[PDB]
Amino acid sequence: ARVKGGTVTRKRRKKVLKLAKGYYGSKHTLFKSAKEQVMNSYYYAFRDRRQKKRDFRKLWIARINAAARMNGLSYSKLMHGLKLAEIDINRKMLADLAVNDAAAFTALAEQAKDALSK
Amino acid sequence: RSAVRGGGRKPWRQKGTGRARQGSIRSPQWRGGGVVFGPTPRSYSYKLPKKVRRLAMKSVLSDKVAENNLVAVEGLSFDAPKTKEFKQVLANLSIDTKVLVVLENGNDFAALSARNLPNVSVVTSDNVSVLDVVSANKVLATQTALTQIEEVLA
RNA sequence: UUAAGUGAAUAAGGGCGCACGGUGGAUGCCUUGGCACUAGGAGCCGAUGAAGGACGGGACUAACACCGAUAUGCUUUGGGGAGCUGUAAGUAAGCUAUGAUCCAGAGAUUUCCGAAUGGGGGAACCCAAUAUCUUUUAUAGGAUAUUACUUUUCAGUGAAUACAUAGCUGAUUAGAGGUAGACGCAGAGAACUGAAACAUCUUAGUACCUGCAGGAAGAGAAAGAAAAUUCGAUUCCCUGAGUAGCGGCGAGCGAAACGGGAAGAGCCCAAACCAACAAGCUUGCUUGUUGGGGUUGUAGGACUCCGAUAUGGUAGUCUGUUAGUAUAGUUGAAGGAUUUGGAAAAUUCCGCUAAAGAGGGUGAAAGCCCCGUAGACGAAAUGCUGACAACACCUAGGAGGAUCCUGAGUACGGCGGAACACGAGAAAUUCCGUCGGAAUCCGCGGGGACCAUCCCGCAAGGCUAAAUACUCCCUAGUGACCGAUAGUGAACCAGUACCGUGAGGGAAAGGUGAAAAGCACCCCGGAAGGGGAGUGAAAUAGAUCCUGAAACCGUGUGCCUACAACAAGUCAAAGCUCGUUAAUGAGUGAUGGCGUGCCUUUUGUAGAAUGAACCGGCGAGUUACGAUUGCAUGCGAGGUUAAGUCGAAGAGACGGAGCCGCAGCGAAAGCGAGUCUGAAUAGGGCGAAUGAGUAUGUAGUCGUAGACCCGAAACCAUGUGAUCUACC
RNA sequence: UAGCGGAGAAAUUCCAAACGAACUUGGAGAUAGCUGGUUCUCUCCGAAAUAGCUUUAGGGCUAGCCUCGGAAUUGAGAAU
RNA sequence: AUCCGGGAGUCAGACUGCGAGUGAUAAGAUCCGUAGUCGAAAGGGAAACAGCCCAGACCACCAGCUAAGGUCCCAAAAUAU
RNA sequence: GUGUAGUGGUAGGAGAGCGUUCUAAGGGCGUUGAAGGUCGAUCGUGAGGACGGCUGGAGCGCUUAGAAGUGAGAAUGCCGGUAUGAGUAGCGAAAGACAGGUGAGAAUCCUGUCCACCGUAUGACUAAGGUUUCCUGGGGAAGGCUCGUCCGCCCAGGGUU
RNA sequence: CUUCUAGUGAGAAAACAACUGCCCGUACCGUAAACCGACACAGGUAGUCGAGGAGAGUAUCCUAAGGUGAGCGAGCGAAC
RNA sequence: CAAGCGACUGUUUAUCAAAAACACAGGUCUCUGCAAAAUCGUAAGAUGAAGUAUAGGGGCUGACGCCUGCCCGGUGCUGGA
RNA sequence: GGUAGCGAAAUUCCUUGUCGGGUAAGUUCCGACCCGCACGAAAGGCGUAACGAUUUGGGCACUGUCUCAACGAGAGACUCGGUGAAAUUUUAGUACCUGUGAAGAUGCAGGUUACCCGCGACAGGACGGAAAGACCCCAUGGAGCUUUACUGUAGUUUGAU
RNA sequence: AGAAGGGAGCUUGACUGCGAGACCUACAAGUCGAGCAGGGACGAAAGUCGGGCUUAGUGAUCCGGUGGUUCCGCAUGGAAG
């Protein structure tokens, strides 16, 4: 009835290790510090998975800033007129257009200029 | 702890060495120390109400008859205990699987040929228990053993 | 050509991934030893010198075993039928079918110390006396036997003191030490701990010391238990019962009878009397010793008078005769071929045996190869247990009640302590120390202070098998027990190595392969070590020898790194090299965003509060007995067995003593669907009006127990130390 | 000469490197309202640091606050 | 919400609006009443920050709207009228 | 199906599950390679589970129920191995030099010469105490605070009237 | 050991010659590398002998008989 | 050259103190008639001692010189009846 | 109800009392005074030759103690060959300022300085290392000691028997 | 101040058994009470009276004492208790 502890532990530990391939020193061959490192990495992964969605808005916004301002439309008045002429493009598509299809972006800027002109 | 052939002299002082405090060489943490809450000799046996025993035996036998597994033989006899005939007795009776044999009383010449392949196992009519029926598939029993069973079981 | 601007690449060394070795022995598998028990035997050894030891014995001898100057062995009686001289290689010497070695039963020899026993002593040493016999011409030298102490019997001798008493001498009887770390009976007898402190109490008459034994001990044949209607030695178990009781009425301690079972069993003295011998011969008949007679409560015996001189018994023998059994043994059934292998017991065909298919071994896993098992047979010798012989021992009726006997400084009282569940309490019963001190059958003790009636018994003398407790040891077995950090401390040459003056404390260390076939020969090297060639299925199985993880130490290389302040990451991402369990692929990473480890304790943590050097292994809420609630199951106004017997250590039925519910109120007499309080039919407290339990499994919690683990400073009881130091 | 003690031209000095009471074995796994630790996972709900009394104040009991299972009427809860 | 029953932890609190005490109408002081948050709460703002302002994460997405607070550059948005 | 609704959480209460050893029955795998080890870019909400490649060479899985010495990262834990400090501190008072031997190998052994140190002692004899360290011939694996052909070390023989 | 008596109690002295004399210790170190201190350790160890020149002297300085050159070194010539 | 303490030679905390501490010769009180008091031991037995008041134990002071006042109400001791 | 004697003392708080001597300058020393917080006659008062590894004040001689340092020798340190430890240690690619914070930061915030790797020196910091505070409180914790604290007892004595 | 304050006559309700229902509160406790029965006081009656204008004047249990009692009493009748 004596239950020995044969190989119930190494499975677990070496499963932890492999999850820590490539850490900047002795944090990949110490079964005590690899675990703490994995824990903090989990925290960071979770937090930043909620930031990946923040940035790209600020990025598309700066790009709409740069491109639009060249047409005499501040980065506000463009969005305002657009949401007034009932045009509802998504920022990501607006950033992509501003970078690539300059003709189309200028068409939209013209419509918006017309819109809040009323 | 108190049974290991150890001692009660401390390892060293309580202080000084800055080390942790220890009371005895023999103790649970040290290698070669006593165990805490290890297995002791016990009993494991216990009985039931007197009625449920009878309900159990009745239920087992009714179950086995419920699927045509009691094969009632008239009477078995062998002058000498020749093992080979028994095999032929079952071959005629077409019982090949794991089986159980119930005999009446000391007509031993019919048991002394039941050290076969363990497909068979022998028992008189006073020791029929629960397992020695539930563990098997078919059951052989002479005609007198049936009545004898129907006596002890009231 | 000038000028302005942009600007790649190289690594003294480092990072990441990958790939290959080295140290180290986790893990997988394995057993040569353990642990807990079952059934049976056996429960002492010693002045005829014990337990335990020192020294010796072999061709070689360091150790372990066995043995003892007859020394690795002597004699005899049975077994057995071919190799043999231990561990352990090797060589030399031999032995053996004229039956070795080996197994089993009987004998013979047994050095020295040790209660140690002639005296002495620092144990395994020294020195004696007296007789007998030896060597040398003799002195010295050698061997043999005896010589301690105490008491129990007997002689002699004996004398302060005559007679005889110490005393002495000689002979004779018995003791004296050990332990089985167990069980029993006594003498003497603690503290920590609980009471949340502590004085009476408890822990506890336990631990320890000492004496005395036995295979068992202790108790045992009523001055008993009871309370009508009785029963008739003692021990042990179930239930009575956590009741009646005791208790700073606190923490706590805690019975007994009745009832059901196991095993059964009763005997022998003192006295009164009767004889023979001896003494004072009071010659009164007193003393004594023998032998006879007699053993009790329904009072018996003596004593008188008659019958018989039988009839039933054993708890004795070491006396025979038989039967059985314990210690060596004998016999014991059935297979070939094919495919993989180095090897088959594996696989596929086709057969056989079983009162034998339990197990162990053989080149992997065997009913049919080997040892065995189921059966059947067997003892020259020795021991035990029966049985029946023979011998030993013991035991008779009826009737009478004139006189005699029926356990003395005892019972019991005061005083002071202990033992009974009972702590002096209203304290019976039982002991111990001191003082006081009964009656004699018309008599005495007891029925929980004490008295009266009644009832039951006869103390102050002994013995007594079985049912019960234990296991150092031997035999045969078993296990939802361990598998080298486990299991004994110890699987191996272990209470050893080592530490301490001493009592005392105490480890680490198993694994080549099937078989050593354990690497001839060459080559470098002083050697060690290595490279070929070989043995081998496998040498990365080569003696550090099965598998061979992690920390730690190295070699090679794909990607990056010398203007950079980094809890060391994650999200975003150019380039460079790849190409997987084939899928929204893998490695690295220039550059940007964001970001103060883990655990515990705290109002609050990154804390400059506190713990971790790193890797591996071990390491903490369990079990028995009670109590209560939920779940479930079998019967339901019922439920239900216990101890114990037969049974395989099981199942598997008997066994109705006992417990729980079905009726409550009252302190109690008692009353009863009611009752208590009260002058009360008043009112009020409590229960009824349908209202379900009980046995077992299981789980949660609680109680007694060390009770989740580790952790003191201290306390009590036997021992060991003055070789350092203090005084002499 | 010995630990309930010994020895001290006196210091709490010495008694086998440590003496306001030696060392070693046993009662003994002594006791600790105190400190440290206690190992696999997910779903559901989820507090308190208050009153009273205590030779009590960092402890404890009951009460309040939390959770789980049942019974019954509700209209009893709540905020306007 | 009440009732019956099984199982606990808790008895060292802290700061901040408000109204009072002792203090010197001093203290991140101490001791009570009352509300929130922290303890047992992560995300945004206050440069960094338990207890202040806003708001309660089952999970995924390179979608959309707002609160507190902000809009020259670090750093998303008006060099607004 | 489809709608509505909820899903932070310490002490703590409740519920459902993963994994290890062993027992029982049924059914299975294994020299045509089991357990164990290593690597892999795979699967489920979790604990966790499969599959393949190499090593390894004798036993182990799967289903249903049962019993537990059943799960480890912290106790200034206990046992073994290995790191950092680091090629750092130290090498335990006192004077040596040359020539020639010896030898695979020399400051460290032998021989020679000069020098130098103690000399009421660093000289001679004894009592304790140690227990073969004594002598002769071989050796260099370990001890010798380095070296070592040498030794109070290892091997063999022999000495105490 | 020397004497004197009480005393059992052939005839012993000394010639010379020739013989008998038991057990245990004896190596080695021994102000040390062999003992006591864990060590091949700047400590401790009772007794005897212990020389010459000066010199009271076993003091001091150099030396006789006699013994030793000590178990890591080679360089440089800074701080401290 | 002067002062304090202690008369002196000694002894003392092995291992943080060597003195002004203790010892010390002298002073004084007190006990004890011998089986002495006193001490070790339950007792036998011992030491005091093979001693006998010029002796033996106990308490305070500490060579030497000059000295050493008052109180017996309280607490002990001795005597009392 | 403190006599003789001493008296800012090994005793005096106010206190460095007041006056004198010693020094250029003296709270320490020595002499004298009495308002002795709180000297006193065997827990002895007051003088004292000699003695003291005793405590305190002042002279002479002498000098690296000092103004104020300088130089020389030897051992260590430093370089090369041989041998070769220890306490400590969560992982570390380990800058400065003013803030902020459990109220003093290498690691947070905002700024400033800064190529990579070593070698010899110093000791500001890492609340540096070694000893689970010796100071203080608590534990309804110990142990050793005192007494007209409680309860008992060895021992000494008294009476009855 | 229609008195609870102050005089005056008679008296003892400064009574026994109780109690629907409330207040308080962790417990143990404490506070109020209409009213029923018995038997009364003062008043012609109606009626009031179970202490004082209301709120303090007190102490578990264990143990001992005194009175009473149709309770129990270890074979039975007493008694001790």
Side-chain angles (χ1 to χ4, degrees):
Chain A
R2 165 177 173 81
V3 189
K4 214 171 184 176
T7 46
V8 214
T9 49
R10 296 173 185 176
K11 293 191 240 168
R12 193 221 324 163
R13 281 165 203 180
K14 300 187 188 169
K15 179 166 177 173
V16 162
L17 280 215
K18 176 177 301 183
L19 242 175
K21 279 194 166 173
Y23 278 161
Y24 251 93
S26 171
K27 302 192 184 209
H28 64 177
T29 15
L30 280 197
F31 320 114
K32 298 220 187 185
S33 330
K35 294 175 185 100
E36 317 168 9
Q37 237 325 108
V38 176
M39 293 313 189
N40 281 279
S41 55
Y42 271 145
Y43 292 51
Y44 280 145
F46 186 15
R47 188 244 295 148
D48 293 18
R49 191 171 304 115
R50 266 89 167 116
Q51 268 201 37
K52 179 201 305 177
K53 334 205 56 184
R54 285 159 158 176
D55 315 7
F56 282 51
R57 188 193 275 238
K58 276 146 197 171
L59 227 160
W60 305 329
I61 277 174
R63 294 200 199 169
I64 294 178
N65 301 344
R69 186 70 78 98
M70 307 198 312
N71 298 332
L73 293 187
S74 313
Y75 338 131
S76 91
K77 284 184 295 181
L78 189 263
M79 297 180 216
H80 179 239
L82 277 181
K83 296 179 174 177
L84 234 169
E86 203 170 18
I87 296 195
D88 285 341
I89 306 202
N90 202 18
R91 272 72 175 273
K92 176 174 165 184
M93 277 310 166
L94 255 182
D96 187 12
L97 278 185
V99 166
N100 294 346
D101 235 23
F105 189 100
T106 51
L108 291 183
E110 198 183 44
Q111 304 215 12
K113 260 175 182 168
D114 147 69
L116 57 89
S117 60
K118 308 278 184 172
Chain B
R1 293 191 42 173
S2 80
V4 199
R5 186 177 243 261
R9 139 77 4 151
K10 302 183 67 62
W12 16 253
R13 293 206 179 128
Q14 170 68 22
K15 289 171 150 178
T17 55
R19 206 69 165 171
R21 44 265 191 92
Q22 305 299 132
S24 135
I25 310 150
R26 267 68 196 257
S27 110
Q29 56 220 5
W30 299 57
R31 103 189 271 261
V35 195
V36 276
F37 310 155
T40 25
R42 337 198 289 102
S43 53
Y44 293 99
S45 96
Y46 70 104
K47 302 169 176 187
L48 292 164
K50 214 160 201 177
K51 300 174 167 187
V52 299
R53 276 86 76 79
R54 200 135 298 139
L55 188 47
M57 269 298 311
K58 299 188 200 176
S59 31
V60 162
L61 279 175
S62 174
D63 196 335
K64 266 198 172 301
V65 166
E67 287 185 347
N68 329 335
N69 289 353
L70 291 206
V71 176
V73 106
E74 293 241 356
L76 309 184
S77 175
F78 305 98
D79 35 337
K82 188 61 59 182
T83 326
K84 186 192 174 319
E85 314 196 7
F86 211 64
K87 192 162 189 175
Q88 192 40 243
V89 174
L90 272 90
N92 302 318
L93 287 161
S94 68
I95 307 180
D96 50 5
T97 133
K98 148 171 294 310
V99 89
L100 189 272
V101 146
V102 216
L103 302 192
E104 42 266 291
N105 265 339
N107 63 274
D108 32 339
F109 281 156
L112 270 282
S113 306
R115 285 81 164 286
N116 220 144
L117 269 193
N119 206 49
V120 88
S121 58
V122 74
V123 60
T124 101
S125 56
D126 328 350
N127 293 18
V128 175
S129 305
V130 195
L131 281 184
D132 313 10
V133 190
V134 188
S135 78
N137 290 351
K138 291 207 166 186
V139 178
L140 270 200
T142 103
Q143 191 181 24
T144 104
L146 270 253
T147 95
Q148 290 222 4
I149 262 197
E150 221 162 45
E151 290 199 11
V152 171
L153 298 177

